[PDB]
Amino acid sequence: ERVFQISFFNLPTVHRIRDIRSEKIGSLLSISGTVTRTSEVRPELYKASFTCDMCRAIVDNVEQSFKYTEPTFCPNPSCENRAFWTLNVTRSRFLDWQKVRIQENANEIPTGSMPRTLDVILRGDSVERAKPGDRCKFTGVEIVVPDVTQLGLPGVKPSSTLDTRGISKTTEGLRSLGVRDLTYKISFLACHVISIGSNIGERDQEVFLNSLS
């Protein structure tokens, strides 16, 4: 089964980097910026393959949603444990992955502020269509990425505590719980990349002349 990529383009409105807000997270958007850095094309784990330790039997086609996940279903009835698994990258499935860093355009920068960068990620056929030093229009989805650098920032950082109300307990003896911080930053996942002119407004001659009407 092949991977299909749906690319949307030509949105009515193109937003700046500074107009990116949190109410548009997980929504279709079109932004623009100057590419300053590009990354190497790397494989991203799409459909992982896992072996249970006790089963020693493998399962296939496990969907990976951003952060690395392991299924707890374990359809083989040999064992009774769910958490322990082992990843095999030989028969797992991957996708193309590139992370290009974009910067605010020179005319879009406000009166006193410095330009702010954004790490926009290209997958599939859109990889390597972005080049360092040109203005590009990225159409995609505003996604959210875990961030660790917000630990010392002011303000109440949200946290996720496990709800214990329907769990029966006994005071037999012989009280630890798993709580994690929810700190995040805004990233972009682009499906279509078009390179607008770096100006205000392929060496062979034949390939250039077929381009013109």
Q: List residues near a second copy by CB under 8 A.
A: 54-56, 78-79
Q: Which is nearer to Zn ion, 19 or 53 (CB)?
A: 53
Under the binding rule (CB under 5 A), the answer on residue 55 touching Zn ion is yes
Q: Which is nearer to a second copy, 5 or 78 (CB)?
A: 78
Instruction: Tell which one of 107, 161, 176, 210 touches another protein (CB under 8 A).
Output: 176
Cβ-contact 116, 2 below 8 angstroms: no
Q: Which is nearer to a second copy, 57 or 144 (CB)?
A: 57
Which residues are CB-contacts of 52 (< 8 A; sequence separation ≥ 6)?
59, 74, 76, 78, 79, 81, 84, 85, 86
Q: What is the dihedral of CA 56, 61, 66, 71, to 10 degrees?
A: -40
Judged by beta carbon distances under 5 to 8 A according to partner kind, the member of another protein, Zn ion, a second copy, none in contact with residue 170 is another protein
Name which of residues 72 to 91 contact Zn ion (CB under 5 A).
Answer: 74, 79
Q: Which is nearer to a second copy, 54 or 182 (CB)?
A: 54
Q: Which is nearer to another protein, 72 or 210 (CB)?
A: 72
Q: In the bound complex, what is the minimum distance in angstroms from residue 172's beta carbon to another protein?
A: 6
Judged by beta carbon distances under 5 to 8 A according to partner kind, the member of another protein, a second copy, Zn ion, none in contact with residue 74 is Zn ion
- For 170-206, give the secondary structure using H, E and C: CCCCCCCCCCEECCEEEEEEEEEEECCCCCCCCCCHH
Stretches 15-23, 49-57, 136-144, 188-196: which one binds Zn ion (CB under 5 A)?
A: 49-57
Which residues are CB-contacts of 196 (< 8 A; sequence separation ≥ 6)?
32, 135, 136, 137
Judged by beta carbon distances under 5 to 8 A according to partner kind, the member of a second copy, another protein, Zn ion, none in contact with residue 151 is none
Instruction: Tell which one of 119, 128, 147, 181 touches another protein (CB under 8 A).
Output: 128
Q: In the bound complex, what is the minimum distance in angstroms from residue 123's beta carbon to another protein?
A: 10
In the chain the first and final C-alpha atoms are separated, in Å, by 39
Residue tagged 């997270």 (tokens)? 25
- Angle at the Cα of 146 from the Cα atoms of 126 and 14, rounded to 5 degrees: 45
> What are the backbone angles phi and psi of residue 205, rounded to the nearest 5°?
-75, -30
- Report the largest interatomic distance among the alpha carbons of the chain, rounded to a whole angstrom: 85
Under the binding rule (CB under 8 A), the answer on residue 95 touching another protein is yes
The footprint of another protein (CB under 8 A) covers 41, 43, 80-83, 90, 94-96, 128, 167-172, 174-176
